[PDB]
């Protein structure tokens, strides 16, 4: 490195291309054995090597690999540098605008331009990781934040975690300040991009910043968001204010993650480090300014929703954000079940759960994928955690405000979107919820009995309701309560009517719900036998579709044998004849033989119950098999 004037015999604009690559490797290696003890920290002809980049980063005649390696030298050239950052920034600016588009859908992957582009991004993350630097972290985020899920950001996120883990609190203050000041300042840009700044970079870093003095950031900034949240409501007078629902939104989203991580001994104690909501000079004994300022979340819950707005999606997820924050402060500081209840579950008629949810999305299921598909909605994981935690921290009054709200409002007074959202918090939480199932089932099974759930026939939500319902039976055992019967009748008639599926493995599963839905759980049946006849009896020599009524009669048989054809509006002299006659349809095994397999159980029933019909049904069977004996010896 001392021979730096002789070294300047290379790096010329007129150089052999393989040697334009080869020269970089020597300085790229040297700093890895040297660790920047010369030609780096304001020492040697550092200004000359650092200005040589102004000639190189201006060339046009290149692949992305001279440039790709050049950006990989930066981790050393701006380690510890207190100046010349504007010399770097202007060539980074001229590089990024030329080589990379505003959106990645410019390219199908495997076109060479894209493989070179993603390699520049790899080389910049390789550069970021061991720069540990706020200059590069800032400059990277504004290249990422332009659309969602477009460069496989799940690889980029790993670099943020890695620098958040391995570094000092003072460097991490520099990181966190630079990305905060970027988000805080209101120089005009698209609101969607403006969300993604916190949401898809800053927030990812916060979750992984080091355990101690992470409080130093929040204690330095906390006054800003609190002073922001208390105003602007008289200025919703034009559409550009979507840039503002974004700021309040992000400002809820940079503190719930700080109620997360942080110790109980800082957030509720005799000594209030975070006493900065007030001046804190006099309020050093005890922390309660949180429960002074929960009012801010309250406004974000209970705003009487506007009559004619045009930002409703951003309104919705704003209401969600402050609700997450209300979870996060309460589940830390407000330790009573009385204040976990709090306002948090207990509203005046500007009711919470009616506000958080879009009321027009058809929100349909898929029983056949490829939970985090449509459970991917806001709040759901937080609320499973909220109830799960307090189940370890011990009553019907908590769910009374929920189950009987969605239950007694069977009417359109709540939309179906609300009822399914409430029901989802049951389904994923049965093992947390067993004690109350007796009075919860009247609401919860009424949902699956209601004439619409969005399901075209059976769908995964009814499957989850009926599975949870059955799963309660051992401890809860609801039978014979006055509504249970008339709903169970509607369940069985529906579950059986729509049982079929084009895919054999799915059809076999629907059928297996019935087997336990009777034998483990109802006397209260009124078995839908008037259907069952139509599910088999429609003659055609190449029908497979008779077979379902065979299989289904095999379920209503195998459950310790309830009787067949009592008073159901159909005649035994026709009904059983068809059920035998099916075994003429010899084209398919499951059509003909399965009818005989059922009948060999029917005789065992009627003979052992000593009823007269075996005097006739034995003759029906015998008459038909004779037709095979003379004509089809194998069948």
């Amino acid at each position: 490195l001392q021979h730096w004037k002789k070294c300047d015999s290379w790096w010329a604009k007129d150089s052999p291309l393989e040697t334009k690559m080869a020269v970089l490797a020597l300085l790229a290696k040297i700093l890895q054995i040297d660790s920047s003890v010369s030609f780096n920290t304001s020492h040697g002809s550092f200004p000359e090597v650092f200005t040589t980049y102004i000639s190189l980063l201006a060339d046009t005649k290149l692949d992305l690999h001279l440039k790709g390696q050049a950006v990989t030298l930066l981790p050393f050239f701006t380690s510890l540098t207190g100046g010349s950052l504007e010399e770097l920034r202007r060539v980074l600016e001229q590089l990024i605008v030329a080589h990379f588009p505003m959106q990645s859908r410019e390219f199908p992957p495997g076109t060479p331009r894209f493989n070179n582009y993603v390699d520049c991004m790899k080389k910049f993350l390789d550069a970021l990781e061991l720069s540990q630097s706020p200059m590069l972290l800032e400059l990277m985020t504004e290249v990422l934040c332009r659309e969602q899920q477009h460069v496989m950001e799940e690889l980029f996120q790993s670099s943020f975690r890695r620098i958040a883990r391995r570094g000092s609190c003072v460097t991490q203050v520099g990181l966190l300040e630079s990305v905060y000041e970027m988000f805080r300042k209101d120089d005009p840009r698209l609101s969607f991009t403006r969300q993604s700044f916190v949401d898809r970079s800053l927030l990812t870093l916060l979750w992984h910043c080091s355990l101690d003095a992470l409080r130093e950031f929040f204690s330095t900034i906390v006054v800003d968001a609190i002073d922001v949240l208390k105003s602007r409501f008289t200025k919703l007078n034009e559409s550009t204010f979507d840039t503002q629902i974004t700021k309040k939104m992000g400002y809820y989203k940079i503190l719930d993650v700080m109620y997360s991580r942080l110790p109980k001994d800082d957030v509720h104690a005799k000594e209030s480090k975070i006493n900065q909501v007030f001046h804190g000079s006099c309020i050093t004994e005890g922390n309660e300014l949180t429960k002074t300022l929960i009012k801010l979340c309250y406004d974000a819950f209970t705003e009487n929703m506007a009559g004619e707005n045009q930002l409703l999606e951003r309104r919705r997820l704003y209401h969600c954000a402050a609700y997450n924050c209300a979870i996060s402060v309460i589940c830390c500081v407000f330790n009573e079940l009385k204040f976990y209840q709090g306002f948090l579950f207990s509203e005046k008629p500007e009711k919470n759960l009616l506000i958080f949810e879009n009321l027009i999305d058809l929100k349909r299921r898929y029983n056949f994928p490829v939970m985090d598909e449509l459970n991917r909605h806001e709040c759901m994981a937080p609320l499973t955690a909220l109830v799960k935690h307090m189940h370890r921290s011990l009553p019907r009054d908590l769910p009374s405000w929920m189950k009987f709200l969605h239950g007694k409002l069977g009417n359109p007074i709540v939309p179906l979107n609300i009822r399914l959202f409430l029901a989802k918090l049951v389904i994923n939480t049965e093992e947390v919820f067993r004690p109350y199932a007796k009075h919860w089932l009247s609401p919860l099974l009424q949902l699956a009995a209601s004439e619409n759930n969005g399901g075209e026939g059976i769908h995964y939500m009814v499957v989850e309701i009926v599975a949870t319902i059955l799963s309660w039976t051992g401890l809860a055992t609801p039978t014979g309560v006055p509504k249970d019967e008339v709903l169970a009748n509607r369940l069985l008639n529906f579950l059986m009517k729509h049982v079929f599926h084009p895919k054999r493995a799915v059809f076999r599963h629907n059928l297996e719900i019935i087997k336990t839905l009777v034998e483990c759980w109802k006397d209260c049946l009124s078995i839908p036998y008037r259907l069952i006849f139509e599910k088999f009896s429609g003659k055609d020599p190449n029908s497979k579709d008779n077979s379902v009524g065979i299989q289904l009669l095999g379920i209503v048989m195998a459950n310790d044998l309830p009787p067949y054809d009592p008073q159901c509006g159909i005649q035994s002299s026709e009904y059983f004849q068809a059920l035998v006659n099916n075994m003429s349809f010899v084209r398919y095994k499951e059509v003909y033989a399965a009818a005989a397999e059922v009948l060999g159980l029917i005789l065992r029933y009627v003979m052992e119950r000593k009823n007269i019909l075996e005097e006739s049904l034995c003759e029906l069977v015998a008459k038909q098999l004779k037709q095979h004996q003379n004509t089809m010896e194998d069948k």
């Binding site: 209840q341 709090g342 306002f343």
Partner: peptide, 7 residues
């Protein structure tokens, strides 16, 4: 419900 807020 302002007294489920506060204290």
């Amino acid at each position: 419900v302002d007294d489920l807020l506060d204290m």
